[PDB]
Amino acid sequence: SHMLFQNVSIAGLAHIDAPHTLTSKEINERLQPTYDRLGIKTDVLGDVAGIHARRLWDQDVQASDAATQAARKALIDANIGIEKIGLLINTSVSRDYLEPSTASIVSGNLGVSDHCMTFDVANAALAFINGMDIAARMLERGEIDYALVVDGETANLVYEKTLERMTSPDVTEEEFRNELAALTLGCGAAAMVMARSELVPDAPRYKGGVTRSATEWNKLCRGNLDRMVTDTRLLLIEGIKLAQKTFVAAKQVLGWAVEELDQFVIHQVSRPHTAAFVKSFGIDPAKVMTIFGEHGNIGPASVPIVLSKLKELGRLKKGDRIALLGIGSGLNCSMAEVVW
């Protein structure tokens, strides 16, 4: 077994693209006076990070609202009603309150039954995969028939407040550099219905995978509702080191050889980080979908949004082996397999 999941399936999947486009060109317009004062002559967003646009919601959209929208769409995709759901996990970085959980708010919106178990999982960009594993352990055992894993991310306030701080006459070069990665974040949402395979014999299978950690690096990227501070240089170097460890494990437990994988669904922090990742493991770039260029980094929703987009694009065929991979602040790294 190697503790891989048996008879756990993806019954439904969906994403929501946030409606309002914010271009790096617009951003650079606002920041230009500060660029000039600091003597920055390069387009650090568009050319260095490789981000050309990102999407935002309306101001009044909460994490629970975006998650609820994705969940209803996924329920339709699995062709089931909310009454079938025995577990709902919300995995987002964004959250409505410290208490109650965002999951309870989403569950109240959807109308789950009084038998439905709900809670949040938080773990930066890897939480959706953590949520899938937790649901999978219940599904494999047969405690429930169907689960929802949900995730809505809102970056509105971080853009609003970061831009104000950075266009201050008094902003220091250090603060500017520290906060710049915030302007690579994006809004979006995703949700997945997982099921016992017996109920959905033709659905994709989720096998799980492996995780490794380097929690001595927990200071590298710190975020709250209106601020994210990031050591981008160190994140890259230490992130890659951690992935290599995780890849050794993936080869032991998953039996992975890169040329035998059909798709790589990778969490994205920037264009150069992704290029370094791919170069490191000899991955065929044709096997790596990216949406960072126009959606930026959607935190823990990124992986399932990309998977959902691949499905919607017709890129996924029966029997395709799909690798889910990411490095999340912590640091953590998880790699898991789906067989379409």
Next chain:
Amino acid sequence: MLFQNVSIAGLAHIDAPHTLTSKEINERLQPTYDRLGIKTDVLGDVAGIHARRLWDQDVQASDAATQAARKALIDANIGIEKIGLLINTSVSRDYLEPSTASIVSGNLGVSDHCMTFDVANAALAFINGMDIAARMLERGEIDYALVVDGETANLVYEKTLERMTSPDVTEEEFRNELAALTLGCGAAAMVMARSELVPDAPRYKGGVTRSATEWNKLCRGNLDRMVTDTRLLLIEGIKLAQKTFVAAKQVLGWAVEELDQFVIHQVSRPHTAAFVKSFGIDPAKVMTIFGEHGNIGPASVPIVLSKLKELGRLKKGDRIALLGIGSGLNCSMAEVVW
């Protein structure tokens, strides 16, 4: 069915160092009380919370949690290198990213194999964390798990007492922030293990979970503010608690006279009284610390369990019912055999 091979290897709590009495709070509120014409001591006489504990300045959730974790490892007689899973279940949190668990894990020096993340579910999350860990242990993924929880209410007291002493405060504003004045600081941590590793240790059997998520608006909390519909929350909270207990009677086979301790969420005197009379539970079998510690959120249940353990009270075979509940509303009831 129930967990078969899961034990509690170690357990610990931290009581916060500074006492804030209700008498001391009331002296501060008094001129607000004299305006508005309030002549009742709600905290002391009605809620029955006479004191709560605060941390030193700038103690973070992660610091409190790390403190409890080091104690719980000592209690379990294991080094951090044996921990394959660390879950942080606190309401309080350092940041949105990364997990507070990664910060505690960094403090402790966990290994590069150790899986970590947060579970958030108001005052229920410790029991949720226990069950998540239990499923991994049963499945052979790990040998030992830490479940940790540090709560800090310092800021909520500072900010709330500011608002309540404002010359503008109205009585309705006062009433819907009053519950914030029943919260308290503290921390707890638990080591869970595969039973073959720790044969004399208490067994955790798991339990049953019910929800009333239509009531998610009734208690809303951030670091600096908690707004609470006290009346409806007490009424619906006990409604769900009553339903989960009925479910527990069915699947765990529970009958009241056959349980030796009830370890319940620590809310208030009337909440407690209302629940205990529903099922004719002996109040002598229900340890309470809110009188002096207030409501410590999801850490309340394991803090009580730890105090019972340290009291040296419990005997082998004692059936201990863990009754958790949290804003949501969510309720979970589970059994430990000592």
